[PDB]
Structure 1
């Protein structure tokens, strides 16, 4: 696929629903996918969410230190509950903002990794997905673990992801299984315009 400028954000769940061994496996997967996606025209940014929100690095910080593993490895887990909708709003408004190094005219891609249903959030998905669509943010979702095995639970993943959901939703049975989708995720993003 011909390469074009892409600004790729990750939004990772840091709720206490994720045990520390699993959080480390998540950090390894984000590190590896970012390494595999690194091309001259890509920038990355990462936010962790629970009921709190932490920008671990902006697109501008990445551009100045474009070393994903070094940026991801030190992060520590927030703990707490699971405010996925507010996390999506903060990605759209803060990570994809010119002040934070997002580029005019680049593709805007968000990968959400969630371990559990939204809970505690003052926002619904109806409060944040229309604005994400207006702003052109292409969303991928990875639902990890037992929380997304039932067909009803999967609706939430579809609600987060861009349409069609079969091309944008991943469900993996546990954190050890995240590596099994690295090449697929890579190819989807490498080829977004092509």
Structure 2
């Protein structure tokens, strides 16, 4: 019915506390969303990308705390745009777990400063929409302490961005995610 994927910033700019904080957020979403009708996938990124768990793997073993805890920080650059592309092409993939007719929800968590990425958001956002991927953005660290970084959130996130962008310690994001699921 609804396939939700997480793309988390593992870049060296994300501070440790905040990496732990991100992980925290993901589990909380996964917890409150006691499937029966929802699968999750997740990937972290640097200049490199890691698939920590796929819809299949989440389906085989749907234990939150047991899928997230392992995940350690990659560090390095921030290839968010390529992260976006790779998430729709690899995670929202049927040979990896994705379903048909199900809604696609991409949750991207980051500080909002892409760096070193060859791709600009204008190279992946269109394909996101063509593929129907709804995007939410959870900004962490210095995400909101900068105008250039705030605009990065708006760029990534689906419209209206006010309904798809929250600071990680704003617990409306969870509330809004539960809503997004009753308004399909």
Give me the TM-score of the superposition, normalised by structure 2: 0.88
Partner of 2:70, secondary structure, is coil
Change (3 A) 1:158 1:123: same
Change (3 A) 1:140 1:24: same
Comparing 119-128 with 139-148, which one deviates more in the overlay?
139-148
1:63 aligned residue = 59
Shift of 1:96: 0.3
Change (3 A) 1:177 1:96: closer
Change (3 A) 1:28 1:41: same
Shift of 1:180: 12
Question: What is the rounded CA distance, in whole Å, between the counterparts of 1:182 and 1:20 in structure 2?
Answer: 28
Give me the TM-score of the superposition, normalised by structure 1: 0.84
Contact kept? 2:112, 2:149, Cα under 8 Å: no
Contact kept? 2:163, 2:176, Cα under 8 Å: no
Shift of 1:27: 1.3
Contact kept? 2:12, 2:75, Cα under 8 Å: yes
Count how many residue pairs are aligned between Structure 1 and Structure 2. 182
Change (3 A) 1:155 1:176: closer
Question: What is the rounded CA distance, in whole Å, between the counterparts of 2:58 and 2:177 in structure 1?
Answer: 24
Question: What is the rounded CA distance, in whole Å, between the counterparts of 2:142 and 2:108 in structure 1?
Answer: 17
Contact kept? 1:53, 1:87, Cα under 8 Å: yes
Partner of 2:163, secondary structure, is helix
Question: What is the rounded CA distance, in whole Å, between the counterparts of 1:94 and 1:47 in structure 2?
Answer: 10
Contact kept? 1:29, 1:179, Cα under 8 Å: no
Question: What is the rounded CA distance, in whole Å, between the counterparts of 2:85 and 2:15 in structure 1?
Answer: 26
Shift of 1:175: 12
Contact kept? 2:18, 2:141, Cα under 8 Å: no
How big is the alpha-carbon RMSD for the aligned residues of Structure 1 and Structure 2?
A: 3.0
- The structure with the largest helix share of the pair is 1
Change (3 A) 1:159 1:103: same
1:51 aligned residue = 47
Question: What is the rounded CA distance, in whole Å, between the counterparts of 2:172 and 2:5 in structure 1?
Answer: 22
